[PDB]
Amino acid sequence: ASQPSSFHDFPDLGQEVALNANTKNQKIRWKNEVRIHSGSFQSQVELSNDQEKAHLDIAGSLEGHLRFLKNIILPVYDKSLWDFLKLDVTTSIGRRQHLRVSTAFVYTKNPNGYSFSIPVKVLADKFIIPGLKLNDLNSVLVMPTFHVPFTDLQVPSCKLDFREIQIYKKLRTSSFALNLPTLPEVKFPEVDVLTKYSQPEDSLIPFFEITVPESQLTVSQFTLPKSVSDGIAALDLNAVANKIADFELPTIIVPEQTIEIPSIKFSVPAGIVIPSFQALTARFEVDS
């Protein structure tokens, strides 16, 4: 943001930059504009990329008061500029001269194009992908639920398929917490980690999206400069202070604190897409 002023109309400027990224949906817009004295300049660059189509567009506009230049004569030809050229408009007198250049690159693609997709069978609680059915190893393995020592985390039971590939849509995590004597004890509520088979809008690639839903964890309260124990020893800080100066510390209590776990999504390809050629076009124009 600039302030033009006297002495040949000081610069007037401005600049717009837009970036928005959604993986395969990448759109970039840039623009500059310049005004000074009796001339101005404006540049535009656009890059649009998406699943369907790609646009690359650049346009350059120039303006300049080159009237005087047009007011020229040719003694070698003994002819004037406008006369010799036989052009009057903007040449006989000379005018505010513009230069306009446009470049347009455009290509057509199919979002689904030529795509190889893994075979997926989806059920309410599981996904089944029929991979190679090699008979060399054991067909199945069953994993019983396990209690992790010193905690309340329960590992959900699972069945592992070797001939096919069996995934369980949602896995359940039991709650657990830390047991401490007056220290901040973090208590973990249950969270269900899921996997969804999706075809994103911003991305042409089919995916299995492993999603961990948000989780709120309860940190237990704790006492501070009143009397502190951590399971190894207990110390009365007020007693310590009274031992030295007969003055006891104010009591500090930190209440329970909730800590938020932002949701996270992991995408693994569920197939590839090769956009099929439909048309390629390029246009170049010079305008004087």
Compute the half-sphere exposure of residue 154: CA atoms within 13 Å on the CB side of its CA: 11
Resolution of this PDB entry, in A? 9.0
* Pair type for strands 252-254 and 207-212: unpaired
C-alpha 46: how far from chain center? 19
CA distance 137 to 226: 63
CB 186 within 8 A of CB 145: no
CA distance 28 to 46: 6
Q: How was this structure determined?
A: cryo-EM
State both tokens at 138. 């054991």
Cβ count within 10 A of residue 208: 19
Residue 12: name the closest of 31, 30, 39 by CA: 39
Question: Could you tell me which residues are beta bridge partners of residue 54?
Answer: 49, 107
State both tokens at 234. 């207990």
Residue 27 is classified by DSSP as E
Considering only CA atoms, give the Rg of the chain.
36
Compute the half-sphere exposure of residue 25: CA atoms within 13 Å on the CB side of its CA: 7
CB 284 within 8 A of CB 224: no
CB 139 within 8 A of CB 162: yes
Looking at 117-276, list the stretches that DSSP marks H as alpha helix, in order from N- to C-terminal side: 237-245
- Angstrom distances, CA of residue 168 to CA of 130, 147, 156, 260: 14, 20, 11, 26
Tell me the CA end-to-end span of the chain in Å, nearest whole number.
31
Residue 8 is classified by DSSP as T
Residue type, 261: I
**Measured at the alpha carbon of residue 268, what is the angle toward residues 266 and 272, in degrees to the nearest 5?**
145
Buried b (16+ CB within 10 A) or exposed e, 55-92: eeeebebebeebeeebeeeeeeeeeebbeeeeeeebbe
Cβ count within 10 A of residue 203: 19
H or E stretch including 106? strand 96-108
CA distance 130 to 279: 37
Residues with Cβ < 8 Å from 11, sequence gap 6 or more? 2, 4, 34, 35, 36
Residue 197 is classified by DSSP as E
Hunting for tokens 């010193």 — which residue is that?
150
CA distance 143 to 156: 9
CA distance 21 to 26: 5
Residue 193: name the closest of 161, 141, 153, 144 by CA: 153
List the chain gaps (C–N > 2.5 A) by preceding residue: none
- Angstrom distances, CA of residue 115 to CA of 201, 272, 275: 16, 5, 8
Question: Could you tell me which residues are beta bridge partners of residue 110?
Answer: none
CA distance 214 to 258: 13
CA distance 169 to 211: 10
CA distance 133 to 140: 12
- Determine the 3-state secondary structure of 221 from DSSP: coil
